[PDB]
Amino acid sequence: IYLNPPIEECRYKLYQEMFAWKMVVLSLPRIQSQRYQVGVHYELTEEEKFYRNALTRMPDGPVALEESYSAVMGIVSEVEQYVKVWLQYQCLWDMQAENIYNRLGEDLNKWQALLVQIRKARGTFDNAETKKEFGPVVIDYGKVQSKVNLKYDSWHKEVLSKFGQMLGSNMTEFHSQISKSRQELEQHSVDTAS
Amino acid sequence: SSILSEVSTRARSKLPSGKNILVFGEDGSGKTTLMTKLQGAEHGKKGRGLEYLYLSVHDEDRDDHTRCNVWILDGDLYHKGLLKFAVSAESLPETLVIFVADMSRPWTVMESLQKWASVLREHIDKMKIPPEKMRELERKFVKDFQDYMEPLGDNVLTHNLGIPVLVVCTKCDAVSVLEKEHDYRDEHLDFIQSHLRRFCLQYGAALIYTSVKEEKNLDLLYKYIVHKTYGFHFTTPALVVEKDAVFIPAGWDNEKKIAILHENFTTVKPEDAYEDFIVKPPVRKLVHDKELAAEDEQVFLMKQQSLLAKQ
């Protein structure tokens, strides 16, 4: 599972957007008297010629900036978490079912637990939605939508089949011992001198 | 639940990521130029506040691709709170921090460097790192410093944060121009190099000279950055033989290795203050012509009353 732009792009491009939205009002020329006041016989310094001091002139202080990055620091962070969830499916191509079988061998019946959360793990998945939107960041799980579906469904089918096979074996035990004990009770020897 | 254990335990071969290399430096010191030239493009775009560069480090020996997070910070002190975005307790143990000392203006190096000596320190305590972890990282960094094969002392790592620190000084080529345009003596270069080495020794830092114009040690800087943040193989020796470009590995520094640099200059003792030895760059821009105030009507009429009075 790759990212065609790596997750760092999701933050870098948003930073470039914020930089554009700053420079749209920041790179404005500074009003100056040098038009005729040639007595400043010196190349206009960039810090003063382009008016690069507006950030120190916040009416509300730096809080806006503290807010701005915060939004990004939120927007990227959780969505990377979302990406992380997708990366969690990486096992579907490199995992040994024998390890799972040994770890959960003879669970409640055979597994009875993880097979329940697998259906929930089918979330972020198996929906008509093709691309997850979040703010201006859209992650398109279009190339994997079918491949991970096939792999996950095959693994689900094999796990379900093994669960059912063990379930049926235990039900052979179930019904066989019921029948035997029912016959033993149906001997019905209630009155006897012995 | 159960899945988050079962699938997670099925981990494969990988290379560690999520490293946050940090860059504080004096504003206008070409820090963005240096790092952009490092990452491959000639130069990105500058701006205000924190800026992001994702450094793409590829290891051909293992043939893998990874990205580190260059969070380059503005030189304005007013933009120091937003540094709380740069370093977190989750990110601290893998942060490598470098300064940009614009050698074209040596007179503004040390204190700006010493400006570091406050900011990060404040940020490293206001985030309230528990003593146990900060001590363990500190001793781990100390041990890593000790074992440099190609040291103990009174002031070695006498004050440090336990994370790798570099002091890279850009615009190296300018040393030539200020050599002639300022008659800046070679003994001055020796003095500033010794002072910077003492600084990097007390913070356990590795110091690298570089010039984007002369593209010197950029490959070496890349090698050292990757070697420190990741642990790649390193083979470059301590290039200190020539003054033009000097490379001090973190651990190669010793007090005697600075006394040897002390001896060859005999003009002014190094114990004297930094700014005393270096010459100040005089301010060029003249003061604006004074306000030509007009005497208001009231005191003018007072003076005219007096004039009509003595007559």
Contacts of A94 in chain B (CB under 8 A): 10, 12
| Nearest C-alpha neighbor of B207 from the set B256, B233, B245, B152 | B245
Sorted by sequence, the CB contacts under 8 Å of residue B172 that are 6+ apart come out as B103, B209, B210, B211, B214, B216, B244, B245
Interface test with B, best of A65, A81, A119, A122 (most B CBs within 10 A): A65
Q: Cα torsion for A54, A56, A57, A58, to the nearest 10°?
A: 110
Are the Cβ atoms of A12 and B12 closer than 8 angstroms?
Answer: no
Nearest to B163 by CA among B225, B111, B97: B97
The residues, any chain, with a CB within 8 Å of residue B55's CB and separated by 6 or more, are: B21, B35, B38, B39, B67, B68, B69, B70, B225
CB neighbour burial string for A136-158, b if at least 16 within 10 angstroms, e if fewer: ebebebeeeeeebeeebeebeee
How far apart CA B293 and CA B303 sit, in angstroms, is: 17
- Classify residue B14 as exposed, middle or buried by CB count within 10 Å of its CB (0-12, 13-18, 19+): exposed
Contacts of B240 (CB under 8 A, 6+ apart): B246, B247, B248, B252
Q: For chain A, give the residues followed by a break (C–N over 2.5 Å).
A: none
Rounded to a whole number of angstroms, the distance from the CA of B76 to the nearest CA of chain A is 9
Resolution in A: 4.5
Distance CA A75, CA B98 (A): 28
- Looking at chain A, which residue has its C-alpha nearest residue B286? A40
B24, β-bridge pairs: B99
Query: Residue B293: which H helix or E strand, with range?
Result: none
Q: Strand B51-59 vs strand B20-25: parallel, antiparallel, or unpaired?
A: unpaired
What three-state secondary structure class fits A90?
Answer: helix
Say if CB B234 and CB B227 are below 8 A apart. Answer: yes
Asked how this structure was determined, the answer is: cryo-EM
